[PDB]
Design a protein that fits this description.
Radius of gyration: 14 Å
Number of strands: 0
Order of helices and strands: HHH
Protein name: Large ribosomal subunit protein uL29
GO molecular function: structural constituent of ribosome
InterPro entries: Ribosomal_protein_uL29 (IPR050063), Ribosomal_uL29 (IPR001854), Ribosomal_uL29_CS (IPR018254), Ribosomal_uL29_sf (IPR036049)
Subunit structure: Part of the 50S ribosomal subunit.
Largest sheet: none
Keywords: Ribonucleoprotein, Ribosomal protein
RNA sequence: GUUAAGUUAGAAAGGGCGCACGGUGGAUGCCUUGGCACUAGGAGCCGAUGAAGGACGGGACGAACACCGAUAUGCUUCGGGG
């Protein structure tokens, strides 16, 4: 997901995908607290994909300053 | 046959000793998951660019340890490694 997201433009191509995965993380715990979910390791992998995205823009702010 | 005097062994409610067989127990014997002692070399300070210490928290899995801060049981990228 590195060159997939390094090549993405700074403004919304991370940010809307940040916001969608925030909404995606918002939905998966609802299935799990009810118990109506199976692939629980994806939920770990979603936040694993979240934290690697917020550090992209923060790295690019260092590239700015 | 009995009468008389007369000796004279046995027993065990339970215990004493000798062996036999168990139980509690944790000593010894052996080992090491850590110690102390130094020698040799290296390092001898970190902080208002927020310390040391923490407290509170983070997993599909329950609390505690260890790891780690709402980017939370790693994250990117640089090498190693298969």
């Amino acid at each position: 997901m590195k060159a997939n997201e390094i090549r993405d433009l700074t403004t919304a191509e991370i940010e809307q995908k940040v916001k969608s995965l925030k909404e995606e993380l918002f939905n998966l715990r609802f299935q799990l607290a009810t118990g109506q979910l199976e692939n629980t390791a994806r939920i770990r992998e979603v936040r694993k994909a979240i934290a690697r995205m917020k550090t992209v823009i923060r790295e690019r702010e260092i590239a700015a300053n």
